[PDB]
Amino acid sequence: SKGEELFTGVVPILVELDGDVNGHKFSVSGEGEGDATYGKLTLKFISTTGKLPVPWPTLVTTLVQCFSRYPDHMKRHDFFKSAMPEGYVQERTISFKDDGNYKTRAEVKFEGDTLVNRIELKGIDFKEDGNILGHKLEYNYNCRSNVYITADKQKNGIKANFKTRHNIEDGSVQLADHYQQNTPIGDGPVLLPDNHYLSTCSALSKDPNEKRDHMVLLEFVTAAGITH
Ligand SMILES: [Mg+2]
Ligand SMILES: [Mg+2]
């Protein structure tokens, strides 16, 4: 695709999220860069308004799959880059087992040379002393996640499903079921993929000199499931 050519080098990234979970309002700003040649993302996020009412790890999937490494033989299946620079809408429902749900709507597009992810997140039906509002999740991430992608010809886009599992401080796990839909913003042709998945590994850390509430993310993502 034409859009693929925008990703051959390192690209700056900005992320801006506005959130409301059970009436608790918050905002997150992120900066970093992506290098799709290596499927590599480095991002630092800061919580900028009200006290973060949910654990950082539960926001990782919401806070730019255009930076996935698609192997050369799978390039014709990369919807995400093909929609650029005009971008795509990405919507999810994230269902936390035995707890509430996030509904997210994001637009991912270029603003000049910079790849931007603007997100609205709404969370409802969370339990007061559940794992999420109770802040009972460890600050870490389990690898790898498989993001299963299929074409949605009717909306000229894609759908995806996947499960993530967040470690609870007692040694148990909190399941998050994700359902995802992406549709192009522009009028150029986009690539409609054969079934495949993104193999993703995230690692969370803290900046020792940062006193604001924050998250540092290093992430590697590679498309797979189709043989050459
Ligand atoms: Mg700012
Ligand atoms: Mg109600």
From Swiss-Prot:
Changing Y141H: In mut1.3; shifts fluorescence lifetime from 3.03 to 2.78 ns. In mut1.5; shifts fluorescence lifetime from 3.03 to 2.72 ns. In mut1.27; shifts fluorescence lifetime from 3.03 to 2.85 ns. Changing S199F: In H9; increases fluorescence at 395 nm excitation. Changing N195I: In mut2.1; shifts fluorescence lifetime from 3.03 to 2.50 ns. InterPro entries: GFP, GFP-related, Green_fluorescent_prot. Changing K75R: In Topaz; shifts the major emission and exitation peak up to 20 nm. Changing Y141C: In mut1.9; shifts fluorescence lifetime from 3.03 to 2.74 ns. This is Green fluorescent protein. It comes from Aequorea victoria (Water jellyfish). The gene is GFP.
